[PDB]
Amino acid sequence: EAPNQALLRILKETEFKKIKVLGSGAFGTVYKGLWIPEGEKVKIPVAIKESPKANKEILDEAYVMASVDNPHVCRLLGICLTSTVQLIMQLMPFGCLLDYVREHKDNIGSQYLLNWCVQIAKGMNYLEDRRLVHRDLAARNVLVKTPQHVKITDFGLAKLLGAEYHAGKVPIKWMALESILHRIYTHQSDVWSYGVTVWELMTFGSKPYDGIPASEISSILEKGERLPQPPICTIDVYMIMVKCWMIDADSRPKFRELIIEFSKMARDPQRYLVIQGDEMDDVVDADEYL
Ligand SMILES: */C(=C\C(=O)N1CCCC[C@@H](n2c(NC(=O)c3ccnc(C)c3)nc3cccc(C)c32)C1)CN(C)C
């Protein structure tokens, strides 16, 4: 009911230089680019994401992105209204945490793993405060700014609630039972996804329910079957994931409490995660351009 005073910044085609192509898929095309804000005398490294139905959707993704401000959520720097709609957002130099955990398995420590968990839990709790259900929380949708700093992305599904959301193609494997069965989406349904996300990291990017068709997941979870205990996980950690995968959504841990546990755990990570051998000129990062 609070009026959304977020400002939407329109950018000049000329204001920024499109460098390389970070990636092209179903979601669209992402480009590595530089943004020079006119008289500003700053260079901002950015990522530029590029039909009326297509244009409608991208703008709603912009509406959500502009309305958020958190050290653990991807920021919209502005939009460019050309022949095509482009979202200009802070460049995350290390891409998605999924590829990162996959590509750096042998050098990823328990301290990092446990902190990533805090950082996600934090962001998710911010989106909770902002009455916004993510609906698509995965390790692929969590970007790496620095290995010491991760931020939540992909607000294409994000739904801003007011005073259980009722709903296209969907993940299934990160989805909660009620979401699969009844398209009921809540912050606690995001807790399920967070649990799954943790499982992805503790397995160093293992595919959830590998070799199981999505049409089977429904009955599987109804039967009481869940994702197994990742080898690096002490029972203390696996229990947290197991609490996210409860049938009663009120029995799922609150994001504010997951922040607590994971922080307690990151105060001594080796007790909780058992990993083998655990022991150009005027450039400014967006996080410093306010
Ligand atoms: C995860 C895919 C993956 O790692 N990316 C997600 C989408 C494509 C871009 C890619 N990428 C970026 N992205 C951003 O900087 C960015 C910033 C803000 N919002 C968005 C949506 C994107 N930056 C990158 C730097 C280096 C390499 C790459 C690839 C990169 C990240 C796994 N997939 C399932 C394969």
Side-chain angles (χ1 to χ4, degrees):
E1 307 304 272
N4 189 2
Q5 309 214 70
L7 310 171
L8 176 67
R9 209 178 152 168
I10 310 284
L11 317 175
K12 280 188 208 188
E13 192 170 61
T14 50
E15 264 181 89
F16 50 82
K17 1 263 98 175
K18 221 181 283 202
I19 311 155
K20 61 203 280 174
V21 180
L22 301 166
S24 199
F27 56 109
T29 319
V30 187
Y31 304 94
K32 190 187 94 183
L34 258 166
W35 171 50
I36 309 142
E38 289 214 75
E40 279 287 351
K41 204 180 167 156
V42 288
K43 280 171 217 139
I44 321 293
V46 305
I48 302 129
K49 187 189 184 190
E50 276 198 310
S51 176
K53 188 90 76 184
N55 274 329
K56 173 232 156 59
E57 288 178 53
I58 189 160
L59 282 170
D60 306 337
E61 179 143 8
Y63 168 90
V64 171
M65 252 207 182
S67 307
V68 289
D69 181 70
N70 197 271
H72 301 300
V73 176
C74 274
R75 40 207 284 98
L76 185 67
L77 281 140
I79 75 152
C80 193
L81 289 175
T82 50
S83 52
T84 171
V85 160
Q86 308 160 90
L87 307 182
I88 297 86
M89 314 139 290
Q90 177 198 6
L91 168 71
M92 302 295 276
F94 307 84
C96 42
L97 186 65
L98 174 81
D99 289 343
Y100 196 81
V101 304
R102 292 180 166 171
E103 267 150 58
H104 307 69
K105 284 162 190 282
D106 321 284
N107 305 283
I108 281 155
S110 54
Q111 191 61 92
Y112 279 85
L113 276 151
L114 292 187
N115 295 6
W116 293 331
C117 292
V118 166
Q119 299 180 53
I120 307 142
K122 282 190 149 135
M124 288 315 272
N125 170 77
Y126 169 83
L127 309 171
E128 205 180 314
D129 300 324
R130 278 284 293 106
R131 293 198 76 84
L132 192 127
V133 171
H134 194 285
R135 285 165 86 246
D136 193 356
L137 182 65
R140 62 189 136 85
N141 286 344
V142 162
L143 310 178
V144 189
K145 175 204 188 182
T146 87
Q148 299 82 12
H149 188 165
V150 283
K151 284 142 169 293
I152 295 150
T153 202
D154 209 298
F155 290 118
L157 284 92
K159 294 283 171 282
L160 197 133
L161 302 192
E164 53 184 51
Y165 171 82
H166 179 268
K169 292 286 150 278
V170 274
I172 315 295
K173 291 168 174 190
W174 290 252
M175 295 186 62
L177 195 86
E178 70 281 6
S179 304
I180 290 139
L181 292 183
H182 315 92
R183 342 139 171 118
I184 294 165
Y185 302 90
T186 43
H187 294 99
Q188 297 300 99
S189 81
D190 284 350
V191 165
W192 190 292
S193 294
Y194 174 90
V196 181
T197 303
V198 175
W199 189 94
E200 290 184 284
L201 314 170
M202 307 302 182
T203 56
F204 293 84
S206 294
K207 282 176 183 183
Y209 311 87
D210 210 9
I212 314 162
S215 69
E216 282 189 48
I217 321 294
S218 64
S219 48
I220 282 315
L221 305 171
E222 278 200 82
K223 279 152 182 169
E225 184 156 38
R226 297 292 129 91
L227 293 164
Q229 191 163 344
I232 65 155
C233 297
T234 51
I235 183 177
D236 307 47
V237 176
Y238 190 55
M239 211 84 199
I240 299 157
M241 298 179 209
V242 157
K243 276 139 135 122
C244 303
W245 312 329
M246 304 259 244
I247 272 91
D248 177 64
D250 299 306
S251 299
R252 262 106 86 169
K254 247 219 289 151
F255 284 123
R256 69 156 290 276
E257 306 173 338
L258 287 131
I259 287 150
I260 298 154
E261 281 315 303
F262 277 105
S263 292
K264 275 158 142 174
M265 291 190 295
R267 289 213 299 109
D268 174 17
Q270 289 182 14
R271 199 191 150 162
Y272 310 100
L273 289 170
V274 175
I275 283 125
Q276 198 146 352
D278 203 317
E279 57 284 352
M280 290 185 273
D281 185 319
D282 304 331
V283 179
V284 172
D285 183 65
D287 288 329
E288 283 77 44
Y289 183 83
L290 319 319

